[PDB]
C-alpha cells in the first residue's frame, strides 16, 4: 500500500529529488482532507453491516440471483456474497483513509476477476451491488466524503469489469 | 506513514480501523503542518548540513578518507558525500511521513549487506549521520529537533 | 455510445414511463446548453495540435521520459505518446458534445490501464499530460465550456489512474 | 542488421534463409572490421562533426536561429545540436549494423510526427544532417565516406 | 452546397429527399441573401483584409519572412500574400455555398504535398489564415462573424 | 462648456465674469449651430469613421492585434474598438461644448494609470486617435476639419 | 499602536503583571509563523500589480460598473478604483505581516464605510472585489500563507459590510 | 544601506539608535561576508547571465525583437543588452548594500519616464528583469538566491 504521503515521497524518491514545494502542496492537501476522512471512516466502521444490508436489499435481493439456481441461492452462497460485499466496503474505507487506490489494486482487484469468472460469480450483479453500496454510503457519510468514497468504489467496479 | 501503519495492521486483523487508531491518524493530520515545516528547513539548508557534517566526518575519522580508505581520491570521497546527502533526503521523507516507514524501506534494509560488500566501514557511516544530526539540531528549534532527532537516531541505530 | 438525450429516454424506457416532467427538464437543460457545447467542440477541433503541443511541453518535454532510457525516448515512442494524447482529447470532445462519459468508457477506457501496464507506459505521466491538456483547453474554449470539458478530462484521468 | 532483415523476410515467408540472403550475411560479416573502424572514427570526432555542421545549418538557414524560429536562444540551439548528436549516434549504429533498420526503428519512424508537434522544420533538420555528412566525408577516406555517406543519405532522404 | 450534400446523402439511400432534408434546403435557400451579403463585404474589402493578415502573420512568425525563409524578398512575400488572397476567395465561395465542400475541393486537398514541395511552412500558413479570420470577423457583424469563423475554421483545422 | 471654464476662472478670481470672457461666451453662442452641425456629421458617420480608424491603427502597429498583443483575439479587438468609440463620443461632446472641459473629466484624467493597469499600449491608443482625426478631416468640411482636428489634437496630446 | 506581540505586551501592561506563560506561548507562536508570513508578504509586493489586474478582471471588469454610469465609467473613477484596491492590499499586507487585525481597523476601516456611502461607491461591489483579490492573493501566496492573508482580507470585507 | 536608512531615522530623531536599530546594524555586519560572497558569484558569471536572460526575454516577448520593436537590429539589441547589464550591475550593488535604497538612488526613480520616452516597452523591460532573476536562481545557492531574489523583486516592482 501507498497512502498519499507515501506516494508523494516515493514519486520524489524515484527522481531522486528532495521533497519539492509542489509536492509539499500535495501533502498539505492530504493533511487538510484528513479530518473529514477520519470522521467518515468512523461512520462506515459503525454502520458497515447496515450498509451491506441496505445494498443487498436495494439490488441483489428479490431477483434471479437469489432464486434457485441463481448463484446467490443456498444459504452458503448468500453468506458468501454478503462477505464479499463487506470485503469491498472495508477495503474501500481503507482507501478513503489512505487517499490512494493502491490498497484496492494490491489487496482486492489483482486476480479477483479471474477467480470470479472461475467460480461463476455474476460480475454485473457485483458491480450493481457495489454501486448500490456507494449510494448508501453517500447517505451515511455525507456528500463531501461520499464524493471521496465514490472514487474508490468506482475503482473496484472498473477492476472487476 | 501513520496511516499506512494503522491500515496494514488492521488489514491483517481483518478489522475496520480501531477507534484508537482513527484518533491516532487524526492527531497525525493535525501535526502534519509542523512535520512539513521541519522538512522544509532541513531541505532548504541541505547543502549546509551535508557539507559541514561531511567535513566533521572526515575530520573525526581521517583514516576513512586517507589513501587506502574507501573514500580515497576525489571521485570516491565525492560519492561518500553523496551517500550522506541520500540519507538526509530519506530523513526528510521520514519526517513528512511521521514514521520511519519510508526511510526503513528506501534505505536501512540490507545497508549492512550493501556497505559491507562495498568495503566501507558502516560504523564510520553511522558517525557521519551523527554529525548530520548535530548540525540539524543546531538548525532546529528544541521540540522540533527532538522529532527529527528521532528519525536520525533510527538511521544511526540501524547503521550500528 | 449514448448521449444525455439517449440516456434520458433510455432511463424512462427502463422504467416503462413516458418522458415525464422531471426527465423533460433534464432534456431542456441539455438542449439549452448544446450551443456552448457545439462551439467548444469547434474550438478544440481547430486547435487540437496546439492543445497537445502545449500539454506535452508543460508536463512531459525536457525530462526523464524524453531522455534516453525513458518511455517517450525514440521517435517511435514519442509519436505514440502524442497520438494517444490526441485520442484522449478527441474522445473527450466527443463526450462533451454528447453530454455523457459512455463514449469514453466504451471506446477509450475499455482496458486502457491494462494496456499501459503491459507496455510499461507511465500512468502517472499520462495523467499529468491529460491534466495539462485540461488546463490548455480550458483557456482556449473559455471557462464556461471549460468546466463541462473538465469533467470528461477528469473522467479519463480517473480511469487511467 | 542484414541478419535481422533477412530473418524477418524468411520468417514471414516460412522459408529457411535463402542462399542469396545467406551470401549477403557472409559479405557483411567479412566487412565487419572496416565497419567498426568507420564507426570508431565518427564517434571519436563526434564533437567536431556536430559543431561544424551546426554552424553550417545556422548559416544556410538563418531563419531557424532568427526570432520566431525553432532554435532561437541558447537553450533551443543547444537542443538542436543535441538532436544532431542523436542523429550522428544513429548513423554510427546503422554503419555498424550494415542496415538502416536500427536508424529507422530509433528516430526515423514518425520523425515527421514528432518534429511537426515540436514545431521544428523537417527540411531544416535535413540540412543539418547533410552538413554532418559533409564534415564526416572530410574526416573519412573515399572508400569509407561512400559507405558512411549512404547512411547519412538515407537519414536525409527519410527526413526530406 | 447544402443542396448537393443533401442530395448526395439521399442518393446513398436512393430515397427521394426526406422531408427534413427538404426543410434544410428551405432554410438555406431562405437565408441565401444574408450569405450573399457576408461574401460581398469580404470581397469588397479583400485588399485590406489580405494585407493586414500579411502584417500580422509576419509579426507572429518573423522567421518565415526572415532571410533564409520562404517569404524573403518582395516577390516571395507577394506570392505568400497571393496564397492568402486565394484562400479568402475560397472562403467567400464556401460562405455562399453554405458548405465547405467547395473550399475543400479547390484548395485544401493535398495542401501538405503542395506546400512542403514549395518549401513553405504549413503551420505558418495556418497562422496566416487565423489572422484572416480575425480581420474578416472584425469587419463583419456579430451574427455574420459567427458563420464566417466556421468557414475559416475548417481551413485552419485542415492546415494544423 | 467654454462658459463653464470661464466661470471656474471667475470663481477663483472672486470677480464677476470679465467683459472679454463674456465676449468669448457670446462667440460660443454664435458658433453653437455650426458646432452642432459638425457633431451631427460625426455621429452620423460614426460606425464607418471608427471602423476605418481601427484598420489604420492596426496597420500602423500590427502588434496591438497580433498574438501576444493586448487586443489579440476578436473579443479584445472589439473592446479596443469600444475604447476608441468612447473617445470618439467624448470628442463629439467636446465639439458641442466648445472647450476641453468635457473630455478632460472623462478619459484625460488618470487615463495613463488605467491603461497601464489593464496592459493596453498608451502610444498605440494615441495613434488610433490620430487615425480618427485623419478620417474625420476626410469626412468633414475644411474648416469643420480644422475645429474638429483641434479638439481631436487635445485628446491625442492628453494620451502622450 | 497595536501589533500581535505589542498587543500581548499591552494587555500584560494593563495587568501590570510580569510575563505569564500563556503570554510567552502566544508570543512564541507569533515568532514561529513569522517566517512564512514574511516570505509571502515579499511575494505579494512583487506581484501586487498583477493581483489587482486579476481581481478587477475576475470581479469588477466587463460589467455595468465599467460600462456607462456604473461609477467606473470614467477614467478618473477607474483610476481611483484600482488605486483603492491597491491601498486595500497594501494596508492588508502591512497588517498580515504584523499579525494583528487591529492595524487595518485603525487606518483602512476608520470611516471607510461612511466615505464610500457618501461618494456612492457600491459597498457590495467593493466587497466582491476584495474577495476576488483574496482568491488571487491565495493563489500567489500559497495555501498556508494565503489562509493567514485571507483572514485579514476578510476582516477588511467585514468592516466594509 | 541598512546603516544609511538607520542614519536617516537618527537624523530626524537627533537621538542615538535604539537597541533594535543597533541590532539591525549588527545583523548587517554579521552577514557582510555572505553579501560579498553572493556578489562574487554574480559578478563572476555576470556576462553569461546577461546573454541567457536576453534569450529568455526575446522568447517571452518576441515583439521587442520583432520588426517595429525597439530592439530591432543588432545595434538596438546590443543597447538592450547593455541596459539589462546596467540593471544587473545595479542589482549587484544593491545586494552588497543589503538594502534596495542604493539601487533606487542609482536608478528606478523616473525610470518609467525615461524608458517610456525612449520608446521601449516598460513591461518588456520588467520581463527581462524577471528572466535575470530566474537565471540567478539557477546559478546561485538557495539561501543567497533568497536575498538576491528579494532585491530583484524590488526592481521588478519599481519597473511595474
Ligand atoms: C419465516 C418462517 C420467517 C421469516 C423469513 C423471511 N425471509 C425473508 C427473505 C428471504 N429468505 C431467504 C431464505 C433462503 N434463501 C435460501 O437459499 C434458502 C435455503 C434454500 C433460504 C431459507 C432469502 C434468500 C430471502 C430474500 C428474498 C429472496 O428470496 O430473494 C423475508 C423477507 C425479508 C425482507 O424484508 O426482505 C422474511 C420476512 N420472516 C418471519 O417473520 C418468519 C419468522
Ligand atoms: C536541429 C537540427 C533543428 C531543431 C530542433 C529542435 N528539436 C527540439 C526538441 C526535441 N527534439 C527531440 C528529438 C528526438 N527525440 C528522440 O528520441 C530522437 C531519436 C533518438 C530525436 C531525434 C526531442 C525529444 C525534443 C524535445 C525536447 C526534449 O528532448 O525533451 C527543439 C526544442 C523545441 C522546443 O521548444 O521544445 C528544437 C529547437 N531546431 C532547429 O532550428 C534545427 C533545424
Ligand atoms: C503519452 C501521454 C504517454 C505514453 C504512451 C505510449 N503509448 C504507447 C503505445 C500504445 N498505446 C496504446 C493505447 C491505446 N489504445 C487505445 O485503443 C486507446 C484509446 C483509443 C489507447 C490510449 C496501445 C494499444 C499501444 C501499443 C501499440 C502502439 O504502439 O500503438 C507507446 C509506445 C510503446 C511501444 O512499445 O511502442 C507509448 C510510448 N508514453 C509516454 O512517455 C507518455 C507519458
Ligand atoms: C471614459 C474612459 C474609459 C475608457 C476609454 C475605458 C475603456 C476600457 N478598455 C478596456 C479594456 C481594453 N482596452 C484595450 C485597448 C487596446 N488594445 C489595443 O491593442 C489597442 C492599442 C487599444 C485600443 C485602441 C484592450 C485590449 C482591452 C481588454 C483587455 C483584456 O481583457 O485583455 C476596459 C476593461 C474591460 C472592460 O471594459 O471591463 C475598459 C474599462 N474605460 C473608461 O472608463
UniProtKB/Swiss-Prot annotation, chains A, C, G:
**Record-linked SUPFAM superfamilies:** Globin-like
Superkingdom assignment = Bacteria
Recite the UniProt keywords alphabetically. Answer: Antenna complex, Bile pigment, Chromophore, Electron transport, Membrane, Methylation, Photosynthesis, Phycobilisome, Thylakoid, Transport
Q: What is this protein called?
A: Allophycocyanin beta chain
Function (record text): Light-harvesting photosynthetic bile pigment-protein from the phycobiliprotein complex. Allophycocyanin has a maximum absorption at approximately 650 nanometers.
List modified residues, type N4-methylasparagine: 71
| Record InterPro entries | Allophycocyanin_b, Globin-like_sf, Phycobilisome_asu/bsu, Phycobilisome_asu/bsu_sf
Annotated compartments:
Cellular thylakoid membrane
Quaternary state and interactors = Heterodimer of an alpha and a beta chain.
Task: Give the similarity note.
Answer: Belongs to the phycobiliprotein family.
Q: Give the record's membrane topology.
A: Peripheral membrane protein
On modification after translation, the UniProt record reads: Contains one covalently linked phycocyanobilin chromophore.
What Pfam families does UniProt report for this protein, alphabetically? Answer: Phycobilisome
Query: Which residues does the record give as (2R,3E)-phycocyanobilin binding sites?
Result: 81
Upper taxonomic classification of the species? Bacteria, Bacillati, Cyanobacteriota, Cyanophyceae, Acaryochloridales
Instruction: Set out the biological process GO terms recorded for this chain's protein.
Output: photosynthesis
One CC-aspect GO term: phycobilisome
UniProtKB/Swiss-Prot annotation, chains B, D, E, F, H:
Q: How does the entry describe its membrane topology?
A: Peripheral membrane protein
Modifications made to the protein after synthesis: Contains one covalently linked phycocyanobilin chromophore.
Q: Does the keyword Ligase apply?
A: no
Q: Where is it chiefly localized?
A: membrane
Which biological processes are named by the entry's GO terms?
Answer: photosynthesis
| SUPFAM superfamilies associated with the record | Globin-like (SSF46458)
Where does the chain bind (2R,3E)-phycocyanobilin?
A: 80
The chain residues annotated with the modification N4-methylasparagine are: 70
| GO cellular component term, pick one | plasma membrane-derived thylakoid membrane
What are the alphabetically sorted keywords of the record? Antenna complex, Bile pigment, Chromophore, Electron transport, Membrane, Methylation, Photosynthesis, Phycobilisome, Thylakoid, Transport
Q: Which InterPro entries match?
A: Globin-like_sf (IPR009050), Phycobilisome_asu/bsu (IPR012128), Phycobilisome_asu/bsu_sf (IPR038719)
- Cellular compartments annotated: Cellular thylakoid membrane
Q: Which PANTHER family match?
A: ALLOPHYCOCYANIN ALPHA CHAIN, PHYCOBILISOME 32.1 KDA LINKER POLYPEPTIDE, PHYCOCYANIN-ASSOCIATED, ROD 2-RELATED
What does the similarity note say? Belongs to the phycobiliprotein family.
Q: How does it assemble?
A: Heterodimer of an alpha and a beta chain.
According to its UniProt entry, the function of this protein is described as: Light-harvesting photosynthetic bile pigment-protein from the phycobiliprotein complex. Allophycocyanin has a maximum absorption at approximately 650 nanometers.
- Know the name of this protein? Allophycocyanin alpha chain
Q: Please report the organism this UniProt entry assigns to the protein.
A: Thermosynechococcus vestitus (strain NIES-2133 / IAM M-273 / BP-1)
| Gene designation per UniProt | apcA
